[PDB]
Design a protein around this ligand. Structure first.
Ligand code: ADP
Ligand code: 5GP
Ligand code: K
Length: 190
């Protein structure tokens, strides 16, 4: 059963997932999404995302290559069918990191995952960590924080998410994440 992690920008998803993959790369495979945004230092094409142009993406979207796509804070993102098929082909549990539109779209597909919402202690803390990571422009930060307020609604929409994890203390959040996935982990014999 695949895993979908969602939550506001700055919540701690990449951080939690980096910990999950370093401990369980034998069991999990990451879905590499396509995006039009520019790489951040340390990000790697084909690893964090497939960094492409809006033009190609729109072309591939129309060609039917994507499971879902969404505009987020000025940029286009999407889960191509191939990024998920590749993981499943290697017999690994596919893990996706997407926004709320992505979650709503995936609910209408046959991926059938467990949905987890990563929530910051509060918006103030979220803003402080996001600003500190210092990877977004002020305009980008404004859009992300606006989206965060708006989307935090969802962690509560009845039946939407299977679980909500508060990323206050990181070790604690990570233990919570692994417990949620303990079955998949144990079954895979990891
Ligand atoms: N529990 C935590 N406490 C303090 N800082 C954290 C914690 N978890 C992550 N961070 C830091 O907060 C920033 C946002 O986390 P990140 O995982 O990149 O969020 P996301 O991928 O959800 O946008 C990063 O600089 C990260 O190192
Ligand atoms: N719907 C959707 N959202 C995505 C996808 N890839 C990344 N995102 C999301 O878009 C936001 C911005 O991610 P970032 O620019 O910080 O890497 C996050 O909420 C993230 O989950 C994707 O393929 N589909
Ligand atoms: K992603």
């Amino acid at each position: 059963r695949p895993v979908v992690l969602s939550g506001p920008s700055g919540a701690g998803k990449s951080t939690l997932l980096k910990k999950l993959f370093q401990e369980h790369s034998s069991i999990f495979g990451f879905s590499v999404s396509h995006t039009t945004r520019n790489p951040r230092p340390g990000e790697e094409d084909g690893k964090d995302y497939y960094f492409v142009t809006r033009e190609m993406m729109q072309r591939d979207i129309a060609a039917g290559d994507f499971i879902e796509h969404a505009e987020f804070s000025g940029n286009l993102y999407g889960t191509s069918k191939e990024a998920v098929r590749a993981v499943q082909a290697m017999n690994r549990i596919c893990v996706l990191d997407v926004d709320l539109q992505g979650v709503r779209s995936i609910k209408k597909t046959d991926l059938c995952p467990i949905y987890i919402f990563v929530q910051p202690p509060s918006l103030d803390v979220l803003e402080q960590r996001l600003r500190l990571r210092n990877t977004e422009t002020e305009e980008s930060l404004a859009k992300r924080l606006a989206a965060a307020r708006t989307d935090m609604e969802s962690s509560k929409e009845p039946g939407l998410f299977d679980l909500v994890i508060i990323n206050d203390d990181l070790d604690k959040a990570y233990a919570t994440l692994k417990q949620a996935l303990s079955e998949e982990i144990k079954k895979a014999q990891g």
